[PDB]
Write a protein that binds this ligand. Structure first.
Ligand SMILES: COCC(=O)Nc1ccccc1
Length: 284
């Protein structure tokens, strides 16, 4: 029974290696990674792989691994797939821990924009969680943390992390992680999966896919928001992505909004993430 070596980048940046039968479905590998991580609330998470074109794709747990990675290496990342709107409602601290690690990468990467003060506050909770109570013995007037807090680090940001860290004395790791999440969850790009697209006139837009629904970022003076309930139907054909929007009360007919994606694979990928978000956040 022939087995393929899988390499998974975990949210702490370490590498997990395991083997699965070469005809294995994605769920088989995912179950192994989640067991390794002692993760029970698995529904929020998934594995990604970098495709031929080099884009992030979700590994479909229901399909053969080989029919997804195709010509590529069996290399994956472990990631948050569905960002919970209220992390306080997750049943386990370890779930909230993996969500914090994902969000720290969201922030450092610049996928999750954040004010100076929120960067310093989130950083202060990470330090409290990981080192515990503020100790002046480590932190002199020239201190720079090993922790990556932001896309661009400044001495003034390092100083503000320390100032707030001092205020958190006696906070446990679970308590600091929950405070991290109460702040992170309010950020306007929290849990927003962004896709480049063109509108029906060819104007460059971004489509964001989140728990609540669909966002169309046009010019920042107008952002169109479609709550999942207002979305009747989702579809792709060629390089196009279509959404059907319900008639307001007393209107005879749904409206159609069409978008042009870079290529057919980018259209299918947006369609599948919308279907999965719609299903997940209809049930949650
Ligand atoms: C405070 O809400 C921020 C937001 O963008 N909400 C939303 C996003 C997509 C559809 C409907 C609502």
């Amino acid at each position: 029974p022939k087995s393929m070596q899988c390499k998974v980048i975990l949210l702490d940046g370490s590498e997990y290696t395991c083997d699965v039968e070469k005809r294995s479905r994605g769920q088989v590998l995912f179950d192994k990674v989640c067991e390794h991580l002692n993760l029970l609330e698995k529904d929020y998470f998934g594995l990604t792989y970098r495709d031929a074109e080099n884009q992030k794709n979700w590994l479909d747990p229901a399909k053969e691994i080989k029919k997804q990675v195709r010509s590529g290496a069996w290399h994956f990342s472990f990631n948050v797939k569905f960002y919970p709107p209220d992390p306080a409602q997750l049943s386990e601290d370890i779930t909230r821990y993996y969500l914090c690690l994902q969000l720290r990468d969201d922030i450092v990467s610049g996928r999750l924009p954040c004010s100076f003060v929120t960067l310093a506050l989130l950083g202060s909770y990470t330090v409290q969680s990981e080192l515990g109570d503020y100790d002046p013995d480590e932190c002199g007037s020239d201190y720079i943390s090993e922790f990556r807090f932001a896309p661009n680090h400044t001495k003034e940001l390092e100083d503000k992390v320390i100032e707030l860290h001092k205020s958190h004395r006696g906070m446990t790791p679970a308590e600091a992680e929950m405070h991290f999440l109460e702040n992170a969850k309010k950020l306007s790009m929290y849990g927003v999966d962004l896709h480049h697209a063109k509108d029906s006139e060819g104007v460059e837009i971004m489509l964001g896919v989140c728990a609540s629904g669909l966002l169309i970022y046009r010019d920042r003076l107008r952002i169109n928001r479609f709550a999942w309930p207002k979305v009747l139907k989702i579809s792709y054909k060629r390089n196009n992505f279509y959404i059907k929007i319900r008639p307001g009360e007393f209107e005879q007919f749904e409206s159609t909004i069409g978008f042009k994606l870079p290529n057919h694979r980018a259209a299918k990928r947006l369609w599948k993430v919308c279907v999965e978000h719609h299903t997940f956040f209809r049930l949650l």
